[PDB]
Amino acid sequence: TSVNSAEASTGAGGGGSNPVKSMWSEGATFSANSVTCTFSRQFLIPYDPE
């Protein structure tokens, strides 16, 4: 048997759930005497084998 036996069905691996909320914080907030500038970037740090 195979899950492919139903042509409109996909296999499912039952992964985990993580109901966290986080912010993407970006933008300049100006004021009379200052500006607060926020930027966000995704970063990646590679696998280093040695």
Binding site: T1, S2, V3, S5, A6, S9
Partner: protein, 50 residues
């Protein structure tokens, strides 16, 4: 007597063909810890020389 068994889990039924009825292959392990207290009598006093 402490009786143990694994709760049987049904395998999939639905749009997949030819499934029949199955059970999930599952086994259980764990640690049985048994604590037994024994009452101990004192040794009898000995009058012997030897």
């Amino acid at each position: 007597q402490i009786f143990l068994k694994i709760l049987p889990q049904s395998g999939p039924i639905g749009g997949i063909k030819s499934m029949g009825i199955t059970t999930l292959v599952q086994y259980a392990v764990g640690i049985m810890t048994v604590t037994m207290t024994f009452k101990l009598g004192p040794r009898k006093a000995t009058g012997r020389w030897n």
